[PDB]
Design a binder for this molecule. Sequence first.
Ligand SMILES: Cc1cc2nc3c(=O)[nH]c(=O)nc-3n(C[C@H](O)[C@H](O)[C@H](O)COP(=O)(O)OP(=O)(O)OC[C@H]3O[C@@H](n4cnc5c(N)ncnc54)[C@H](O)[C@@H]3O)c2cc1C
Ligand SMILES: Cc1cc2nc3c(=O)[nH]c(=O)nc-3n(C[C@H](O)[C@H](O)[C@H](O)COP(=O)(O)OP(=O)(O)OC[C@H]3O[C@@H](n4cnc5c(N)ncnc54)[C@H](O)[C@@H]3O)c2cc1C
Ligand SMILES: NC(=O)c1ccc[n+]([C@@H]2O[C@H](COP(=O)([O-])OP(=O)(O)OC[C@H]3O[C@@H](n4cnc5c(N)ncnc54)[C@H](O)[C@@H]3O)[C@@H](O)[C@H]2O)c1
Ligand SMILES: NC(=O)c1ccc[n+]([C@@H]2O[C@H](COP(=O)([O-])OP(=O)(O)OC[C@H]3O[C@@H](n4cnc5c(N)ncnc54)[C@H](O)[C@@H]3O)[C@@H](O)[C@H]2O)c1
Lengths: 463, 463
Amino acid sequence: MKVIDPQHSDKPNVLILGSGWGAISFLKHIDTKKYNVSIISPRSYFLFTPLLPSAPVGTVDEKSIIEPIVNFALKKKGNVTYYEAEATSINPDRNTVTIKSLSAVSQLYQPENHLGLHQAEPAEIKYDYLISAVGAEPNTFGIPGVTDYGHFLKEIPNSLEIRRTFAANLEKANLLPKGDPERRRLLSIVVVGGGPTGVEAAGELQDYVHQDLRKFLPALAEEVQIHLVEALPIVLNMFEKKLSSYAQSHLENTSIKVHLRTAVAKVEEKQLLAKTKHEDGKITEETIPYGTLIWATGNKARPVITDLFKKIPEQNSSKRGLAVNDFLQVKGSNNIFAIGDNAFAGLPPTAQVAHQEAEYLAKNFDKMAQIPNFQKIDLLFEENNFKPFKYNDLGALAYLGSERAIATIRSGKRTFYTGGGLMTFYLWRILYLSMILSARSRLKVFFDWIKLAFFKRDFFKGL
Amino acid sequence: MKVIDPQHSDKPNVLILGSGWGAISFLKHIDTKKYNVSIISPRSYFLFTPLLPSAPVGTVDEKSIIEPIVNFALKKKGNVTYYEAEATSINPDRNTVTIKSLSAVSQLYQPENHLGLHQAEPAEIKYDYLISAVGAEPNTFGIPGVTDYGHFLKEIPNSLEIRRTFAANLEKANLLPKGDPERRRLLSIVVVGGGPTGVEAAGELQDYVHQDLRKFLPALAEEVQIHLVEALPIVLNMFEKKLSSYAQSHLENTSIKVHLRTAVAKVEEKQLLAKTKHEDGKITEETIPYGTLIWATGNKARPVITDLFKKIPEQNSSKRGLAVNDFLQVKGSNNIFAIGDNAFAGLPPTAQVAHQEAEYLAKNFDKMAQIPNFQKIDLLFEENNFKPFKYNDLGALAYLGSERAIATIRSGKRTFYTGGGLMTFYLWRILYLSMILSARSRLKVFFDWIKLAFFKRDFFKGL
Ligand SMILES: Cc1cc2nc3c(=O)[nH]c(=O)nc-3n(C[C@H](O)[C@H](O)[C@H](O)COP(=O)(O)OP(=O)(O)OC[C@H]3O[C@@H](n4cnc5c(N)ncnc54)[C@H](O)[C@@H]3O)c2cc1C
Ligand SMILES: Cc1cc2nc3c(=O)[nH]c(=O)nc-3n(C[C@H](O)[C@H](O)[C@H](O)COP(=O)(O)OP(=O)(O)OC[C@H]3O[C@@H](n4cnc5c(N)ncnc54)[C@H](O)[C@@H]3O)c2cc1C
Ligand SMILES: NC(=O)c1ccc[n+]([C@@H]2O[C@H](COP(=O)([O-])OP(=O)(O)OC[C@H]3O[C@@H](n4cnc5c(N)ncnc54)[C@H](O)[C@@H]3O)[C@@H](O)[C@H]2O)c1
Ligand SMILES: NC(=O)c1ccc[n+]([C@@H]2O[C@H](COP(=O)([O-])OP(=O)(O)OC[C@H]3O[C@@H](n4cnc5c(N)ncnc54)[C@H](O)[C@@H]3O)[C@@H](O)[C@H]2O)c1
């Protein structure tokens, strides 16, 4: 029951799922004069995921790297509606999306209707076009215990969750005497995943331990040991070999114990079972005790997308995400598009890919606006002659700790960059600032780095 | 059981209760070469209470107006120990203080002992001298419902508690249609107390509603009504009549409904019963519906101080706080001192008073260091010839909203200030910045005000 369906306007109802890179990048460029836009997301803010590994340790504040959805929609002149809720079912036959956990509805540039909704009431939202940018969710690979005893580094609440844990262990351990093995354990951190998230997380945590904790509890700081665990034989594989080594070396120089070729078989409350494959093909078992565990491995399709696989014939055998056209249309659907991590275009799950995908689609959308037939769709795209989506790989950036980073900057075939150390760390800084989506988020981080230069980090367990 | 008592050193063990204005101002000036200092407080940070009314609405961030205790103790060269716990009993006969809810113990500039304490374990902390600066706690006057349905503006968790409430009501109300009286109620705020805390709280809340909420939900913003309730016939009575009127007028011009001569008799979930005395001496009853209620009235002695009243003969009949000498020594005690709100010197309960009291005592303490007899105390003070505490009233400052404030600046008999509007608002700004206790807290707020000038306030219900 309960169906929301506004259509007094002679504009198509475009409906966006998500408030991330895809969803927001799309919103930034969509023509609200030609279309009526509605957004559904449980998160009322955009999250600049690349600096999320700085939040917990407090290099940057959780508020500095987020921006309200409504601040974006305010720059769009036309009608924007934001439902603060989560999409539970996509219904292609009815062209609605069932939502759940409705917190709020904001109607911007709309001095008009009242939907008659109540909080936490279920409702179907009709759409003429659907853009699905709900992102992926963290994958535990069915490795038992991960969720029970570990923390993802994925959203903002995760950042607080980590600080509270580490804070609590610092407090508990410092009461125990130096000898106690429990004290050594509680001061142990284990970051699973040698992908940039994990590398940056391990590095940031270290910077704090070296630069801040040491300033007033050096007896503790010395006993803290940070482990990084990677199943592959190399860290940051998306970079050149030359840089993946320098990263690994530098991490080790900052006192991080890098466990290469090591796969976590199980996670217990106070330790995790690791298997390691060696050069000679032998498998050895290790036990790594831990106080804090950060799980920064790969991601996985959300149940809403899994749900949808079964409802469309030619998605039945999809797994990673929605199989999608060269025009980023969900195969088997006449009016649904998918961008970013919930889509499958055999491209890397990266904000870079989501950003481009979004822009391409938005431009296609105002192109559709000037064609009678859109006012069955599969064919019109090729018929009316506009390009398929071609991804342009711009490169990669990763902070390694101790004011060092690696970089590669390309466009197409040419590669032009500096990927060393201290120089690259500044580049990394600048480049990140620049590719932030808002002046506010930009100014906040600029100030956060200046205060860092003079006073180095806030670590409040209740804030 | 369990008594902590370090005394290998030939220095007296000075023990401080609290991490506020008294406790910290005292710490800033106490001579740690002559004395071994220990602090007990459940709060691990200093709170700049004058800007606490800016936190909830997000003019300033909760982190910008707080500073860790250990940051202060780090500037003190000698031994400082911080117990993160609350004092539950003061024991004059034993010269110990029983503590409870022990979270952590930090020993700074002490490469030495291990106390053998565990978390949430009870323990008595011995002292040679005790300074009690635990402050007061909010007074509901036994008016039923206040705690059940209302929020104090006292500590940092209060600021989050208020934002969450207001945020929740904004979300709920916006779903209801304009007509609905529930919508009007949920958008209703009631700030009890015409003291500067309430005035500033009501004003800040207003600035947000006018300057921010209006930018994206003007239909809501218009329906929000802020009430201010004061039992006396005037607001901000500590100021001259001329200024108390201008304040009241300006508040009314910013659309705040000021209920003068109005005392809250009872608080229900959705409304509160008010009685109002009129010019002609008639009592009329009012019902003020509310969604959010902020209780910013007077304060009250904590149970730890109440507990102590009974243990000392000449404190038996104390009520507001500990009766105290002209040397700020607790009457009836030979080694206990009390400063700030938990003390009673017939002076106003203000950070200004607590700041001076603390300095005076610290200076007295290094004076005691050079006299054999301190290495029974009541007499020595007058005998060894140093001044009693004389309070110097420096004046008063209060922000009124809409970038206006009132000010009075004096020292002794002479009064020299500008107390008008926009001018005074800047003065207010400068003067507050200057009387912050740390460069970090100072820089943070300076940046918070600049970001305000360009982007106006973060209002995140989960942060
Ligand atoms: C810690 C970290 C660091 C990273 N650093 C980098 C980097 O430096 N460079 C880089 O290129 N990439 C980086 N990434 C990857 C990048 O963040 C992702 O590729 C990107 O988020 C994908 O964009 P998206 O819009 O598909 O999903 P997201 O950006 O995650 O957004 C998905 C949105 O969907 C919402 N949502 C979830 N479920 C529902 C539902 N049922 N209904 C409605 N909405 C829903 C979410 O709240 C979210 O707003 C990083 C990722 C992480 C976790
Ligand atoms: C919102 C607000 C705004 C204010 N604005 C102003 C202003 O503009 N100007 C002004 O002059 N005054 C102002 N005040 C008043 C001023 O803050 C107090 O008079 C001053 O804080 C008193 O200092 P204190 O050390 O006595 O107590 P506080 O500064 O309150 O500090 C008390 C300390 O004791 C700790 N504590 C509590 N219980 C225990 C226990 N059992 N054991 C150990 N520690 C304990 C607390 O955590 C805290 O660290 C304001 C107060 C509030 C609430
Ligand atoms: N182009 C850019 O601007 C840019 C920059 C930085 C990062 N990124 C992207 O950000 C994304 C962040 O993802 P990520 O950092 O989690 O990398 P990832 O999730 O792709 O890699 C996770 C790693 O964990 C390892 N792993 C899996 N299971 C394991 C187990 N049981 N035990 C131990 N290790 C295990 C895997 O071998 C893998 O290398 C990446 O996809 C990356 O491409 C993009
Ligand atoms: N010198 C400075 O720099 C400076 C500046 C501002 C404030 N201050 C001090 O800080 C404090 C700020 O205010 P506060 O939080 O202490 O409040 P307060 O204790 O100053 O006053 C509380 C107010 O609430 C009223 N009230 C009491 N019961 C009531 C009821 N049932 N219904 C309605 N109203 C009721 C009282 O009449 C009183 O006006 C003051 O004590 C002030 O002296 C100092």
